[PDB]
Design a protein around this ligand. Structure first.
Ligand SMILES: CC(=O)N[C@@H]1[C@@H](O)[C@H](O[C@@H]2O[C@H](CO)[C@H](O)[C@H](O[C@]3(C(=O)O)C[C@H](O)[C@@H](NC(C)=O)[C@H]([C@H](O)[C@H](O)CO)O3)[C@H]2O)[C@@H](CO)O[C@H]1O
Ligand SMILES: CC(=O)N[C@@H]1[C@@H](O)[C@H](O[C@@H]2O[C@H](CO)[C@H](O)[C@H](O[C@]3(C(=O)O)C[C@H](O)[C@@H](NC(C)=O)[C@H]([C@H](O)[C@H](O)CO)O3)[C@H]2O)[C@@H](CO)O[C@H]1O
Lengths: 287, 237, 99, 39, 49, 237, 237, 287, 39
């Protein structure tokens, strides 16, 4: 059943059919199998040597795109009287915050991939020039010890991987390997990640890549700036299993699949598709 | 020929004279854990016939306004027979499942049930940001009910649920659905009390209807674990 | 996957996923039609082929529509399903669609 | 790939293997073309 | 015509399905119009706390 | 096996799950005009799929007091689709026909229709010496009705009509009749607007009857010309 | 020898005793669509002689102040004969064209007509930013007239129009022009009612003149589709 | 008839001719063929081994140049009270806005090529320095969903291709493949792109590469700047068919071939070439 | 070309094939040199 497919299948010419006991257009949906009726059996076809390629739909390409997974802006200044991200922040990595990437990953049940991480930094004066700051992004394992201050000694990063980059350089980039304790990440998890009953549902910690701690290395300047850090993730060397029904209702939370639907169709809880006047009303009918 | 079928495992057997072939999830078949995929090093127990047999759950009634039913595995069987005992006494378990859903009526009745096995069916809650609680998920042998089958209670859709292993029970055609499920997980074994590999969903896409004598039309589910293996023996939980 | 053919006001949830047909009093009756752009909103949008295709801009290939009759065993009938290549207005009579 | 860890390599877009039948025809008994599916 | 006896329902349902055949091809990937967001999802900002 | 059938021609197809084998008139099959039987010397046009396909005519209602219906060929199709256009633009035509008559009911209905293809069915008028007029004969797509089916409206008899290619639609047995007709004439080709080679007759020998819910029971005719050829091209008539 | 010519297609033939060889656009010749270039998978209809024949359009009068004439293809023939019928009943069409322009006069007359086949002749409107409308473009069998032949009504020039397949009718030399056109498009087939592959333009670069008896001097166009193929059969538009 | 030509053809010496029935200098323009009279037949020639190359006129080189196709300047600032491109813009790609490139492409009927796109950015203060801003150019398919704000979540670009670049870096560059749904682009289209009669004439949507959405990623600064983005396109791997008469009248619109002509020759509607006193008047005659 | 997609490659300036006759002499019957074109 398995084979190598590089182009769409060709069509063979077909003749008139009038055979007793042969009914290719009839099927039985109850079996769970999709109709196997071929065009050649439904109508008279001609021969067509189809050269249309199928590579753009390869899973590697479908998911192989650097998508925004994190966007964080904070104030870079003297935080003497701040209540607030004081020249640094910590982000628990997750791929559930931005909907375009989330919906695509959720088209699958399990996924195994390495993750190329790209970090883009932008600055704005709160005018007399934009400073070329040096930033440090330290990878701190899930639930591990994160820094509490811009100048914490935790940033010495003796074992944690840290990347130092300048705003004037191209975006920083590095690859995090497929690091799950299992053979694949669980895009969905129908269970509780704890031995007691009060744990969180649908959250398998084994699927959390980890914490990303980012700080501005430079001491504060006499004036304040707004610094925004954007993180992009591109999966590669991908293996995917068990495709799933696409998300239709708007997402509500990054922690679950809770739904509500839009106020009015399309994509409302009682009507996914927009309405038409009746089942015999042809929208966009050619007049 | 492909309308009659007999399933026999252990001391249990089931026949149907109105089947529609049968489904092997993703074209696979259950099997024991091979040495090259094993992780837990203790010698496993493979009880065979005491656990790999059909367990019939309590029936449910198909009503004109029913929204659908679901049963999570292994949860639905974690307290039934010797399968349940092994599950309670062992930290780890592994198995496939042979599912047989039953529903007969009359040549004058109409209705269509989608019988689908959903892997990792993580439920969502409706109109709230609070995640579903333990009791919303773990229903055991009784199973649960769909609140919004239209979106599979997870914000997606039943329309595309056919992407999962399934069959249908269309009353004018058949009276049973059969699906064989292999071990489905990212790990070779798992803790049976906190994670459900599969969710059996039975949803009436076309409501039950007739103009003949009204009778209670039940839907019954029989499930047989297959190639059961258990590791990490201790006391019962 | 299931087409949402009954995408009409008054049809809620799963009622939108099935098309009801009744015993007719007249002959050659039109039962329903289906817009075909798998790239626009309509009965075909929330399907496996529709959803995935909408992640792309160009498409080519044959489509297949399968209908399952869910009436009782004692119910009989014959229907005609027609695909009309583009160019004009949607046919409203069987004599036209049948071509 | 000049890096020492293979997972650092560029994408692998050469896997053209397919088996739609695991999704389209997961029935135990193969369905013959033209023959009535239910017999 | 749909013809049924007295005790059968005289209104029956059809379920229509659609799929592509293996002569299908898709090109030029783009963001899907079927999903979007105008605000941060609940809990997104908490990932920073 | 001989109860199910699929007919496919051009962009059209038809299936039946309650057939009764099918009839090949006089054991023949349609074919194109061979060089050794040809008369008209101009190169013919053989449109194939644009004309050799199923054309479904308007249905008729089978009533308790119906006498029967008839459709003459090629007249019934002379104004339908591309077959009709070729007929109007050409002085000469030639073709066979694949006829499929449809009529379904209920396991509680009874009735029997004689479905016969009559070659050269020259009608007679009742109780008058005046020959039938143009409008009594050329009904087109609507077809006509039998005045005295007992004598086939020609002074002979329906009892012996079985000598012609035919099938029956006996409701308890089948819901369709299929007859394949070859070119039938004394000439290799003919002028389609003034001569009808065949007449399809559908006559209820046993009236429609039941004691269950009364419903409109239609009879539908689908006809596919076969191996169409046209000669003598000019303007449309 | 290269001054006399007979063209014969279907039931039509044309001769000229004052030709000037004949042009094969871009050195090509019409042909049917090969399997390795095909896209539409339905079996096409190839009517041959009923469509691949000469269609003569209404003549136009060459006057001392004429600016020129044009006819777009297939538009000019979309409502003529069986070619027109196939075009109306099918979503897709494909064909080449054999063009023969005729104009005779006297040994005392002078005049020169540029007869050119322009691929994708997208017209422009004069002194306005508003694009030409449907009725400015689709003239059908009647064809249209040039407003500013000097710039080919598209802001370019007739001076360089010789880059397109063409011939001339110089009265002292010949009385006809013949151009064979192959299918010209970026797609293997097209919808005939909204796109014109070629535009036949006949423009008097040297005006008609004489000092002998004044007579009406017509220009006549005869066009024969070649290797016609149609796909996507349905009802007539 | 087809052959490989790398240099202009050589000339062969020729002798005196006086042959009855042979008239190489006479031709018949009516046939549509260009004169085949050779220099050797018109005059007495010498032998010349011609080494002049013909590569600069290869279609690949003739059209192989990065030409300006889009120039857009907008204000980068706090657009609180703006009616206006608010720190971003959308451009429906087309090659009809700048005349030098347009006229060259229009020398052909059909063209098949891949397009190298180069994006050049320039900034000016509305003085205290020029900021090194980061821009994002997202490719959004023809007629597809474009962003409505600088900070729209649409910019997450989950599947659309996006390129992020700095004003201090060399111009951004990438290649858009030949993406037409047909085997070649239609430079000219004598038809209507819709099934109804009110559609636009001469515009085949199949020939519109798509939308280019460009934004400044940085939040606004305390002062305003004028930012200009220039896009250049260079076709390559070119195949061309059916050359055409060159455009003479000035262009009027990007949507059609409408013409008016200059007010006075040259290139006026009634006179393309400038006038001379008479057909016997020699301009620039050597005195 | 170090990119994986061939369309990303640099220009192809090596096609020296030509056939002017498709534009200069698209006549069905070739015209002989010196011979009267019209006969
Ligand atoms: C007015 C009328 O005759 N009929 C309307 C009918 O048009 C309307 O349908 C909606 O119409 C819009 C066009 O205005 C879209 O086509 C809607 O479709 C989609 C889209 O394809 O863009 C589907 C998509 O899934 C939706 N996405 C999300 C993330 O929710 C988008 C989205 O809502 C829009 O883009 C909004 O910006 O819409 C289509 O449903 C129906 C509604 O019942 O009502 C008729 O009366
Ligand atoms: C004064 C006299 O004796 N005779 C003029 C004669 O010179 C004039 O001709 C014009 O003269 C100019 C030189 O001044 C150019 O040579 C004009 O030619 C072109 C050019 O080659 O540059 C042709 C070109 O196509 C034009 N381009 C465009 C885009 O329109 C340009 C263009 O107009 C100029 O460059 C303007 O800047 O001109 C040539 O015609 C004629 C006019 O009738 O009149 C004589 O009296």
């Amino acid at each position: 059943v398995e084979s190598i497919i590089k182009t769409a299948t060709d069509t063979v010419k077909s003749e008139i059919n009038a055979e007793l006991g042969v009914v290719p257009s009839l099927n039985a949906v109850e079996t769970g199998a999709t109709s196997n009726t071929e065009p050649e059996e439904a109508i008279q076809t001609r021969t067509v040597i189809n050269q249309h390629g199928v590579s753009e739909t390869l899973v590697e390409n479908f998911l192989g795109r650097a998508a925004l997974v994190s966007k964080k802006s904070f104030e870079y200044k003297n935080h003497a009287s701040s209540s607030t991200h004081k020249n640094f922040f910590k982000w628990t990595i997750n791929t559930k915050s931005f909907v375009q990437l989330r919906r695509k990953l959720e088209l699958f049940t399990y996924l195994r991939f390495d993750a190329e991480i790209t970090i883009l930094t932008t600055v704005a004066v709160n005018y007399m020039g934009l400073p070329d700051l040096t930033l440090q992004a330290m990878f701190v394992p899930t639930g591990a010890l994160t820094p509490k201050e811009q100048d914490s000694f935790h940033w010495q990063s003796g074992s944690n991987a840290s990347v130092f980059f300048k705003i004037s350089d191209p975006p920083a980039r590095m690859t995090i390997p497929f690091m799950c304790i299992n053979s694949a990440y669980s895009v969905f998890y129908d269970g509780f990640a704890g031995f007691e009953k009060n744990g969180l549902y649908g959250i398998n910690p084994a699927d959390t890549i980890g914490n990303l701690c980012v700080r501005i290395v430079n001491e504060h300047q006499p004036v304040g700036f707004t610094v925004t850090v954007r993180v992009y993730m591109k999966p590669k060397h991908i293996k995917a299993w068990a495709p799933r029904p696409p998300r239709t209702m708007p997402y509500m939370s990054i922690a679950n699949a809770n739904y509500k639907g839009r106020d009015t169709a399309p994509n409302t809880l009682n009507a996914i598709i927009g309405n038409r006047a009746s089942v015999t009303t042809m929208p966009h009918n050619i007049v | 020929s492909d309308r009659v079928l007999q399933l026999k495992l252990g001391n249990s057997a089931i026949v149907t004279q109105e089947a529609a072939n049968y489904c092997c999830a993703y074209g696979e078949w259950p099997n024991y854990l091979p040495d090259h995929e094993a992780v837990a090093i203790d010698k496993p127990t493979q009880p065979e016939t005491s656990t790999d047999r059909f367990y019939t759950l309590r029936s449910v009634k198909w009503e004109s306004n029913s929204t659908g039913w679901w049963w999570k595995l292994p949860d639905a069987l974690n307290n039934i027979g010797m399968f349940g005992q092994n599950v309670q006494y062992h930290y780890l378990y592994r198995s496939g499942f042979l599912i047989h859903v039953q529903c007969n009526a009359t040549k004058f009745h109409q209705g269509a049930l989608l019988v689908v096995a959903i892997p990792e069916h993580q439920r969502g809650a409706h109109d709230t940001t609070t995640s579903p609680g333990f009791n919303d998920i773990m229903k055991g042998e009784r199973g649960g009910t769909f609140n919004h089958p239209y979106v599979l209670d997870d914000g997606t859709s039943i329309a595309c649920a056919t992407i999962f292993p399934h069959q249908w029970i269309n009353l004018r055609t058949n009276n049973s659905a059969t699906i064989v499920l292999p071990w489905m997980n990212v790990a070779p074994m798992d803790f049976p009390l906190r994670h459900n590999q599969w969710t059996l969903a039975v949803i009436p896409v076309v409501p039950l209807g007739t103009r003949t004598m009204s009778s209670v039309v039940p839907i019954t589910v029989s499930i047989a674990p297959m190639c059961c293996e258990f590791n990490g023996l201790r006391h019962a939980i | 996957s299931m087409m949402e053919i009954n995408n009409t006001d008054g049809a809620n949830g799963m009622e939108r996923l099935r098309v009801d047909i009744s015993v007719q009093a007249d002959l050659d009756q039109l039962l329903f039609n289906i817009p075909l752009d798998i790239q626009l909103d309509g009965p075909l949008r929330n399907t496996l082929v529709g959803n995935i295709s909408r992640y792309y801009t160009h498409w080519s290939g044959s489509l297949e529509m399968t209908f399952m009759f869910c009436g009782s065993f004692m119910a009989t009938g014959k229907l005609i399903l027609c695909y009309t290549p583009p160019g004009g207005s949607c046919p409203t009579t069987r004599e036209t669609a049948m071509l | 790939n000049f890096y020492k860890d293979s997972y650092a390599a560029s994408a692998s877009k050469q896997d053209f293997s397919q088996d739609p039948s695991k999704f389209t025809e997961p029935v135990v008994e193969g369905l013959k073309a033209g023959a009535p599916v239910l017999k | 015509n749909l013809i049924v006896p007295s005790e059968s329902s005289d209104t029956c349902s059809l379920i229509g399905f659609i799929a592509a055949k293996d002569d299908f091809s898709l090109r030029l990937m783009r963001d899907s119009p079927d999903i979007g967001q105008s605000n941060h999802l609940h809990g997104a900002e908490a990932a920073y706390q």
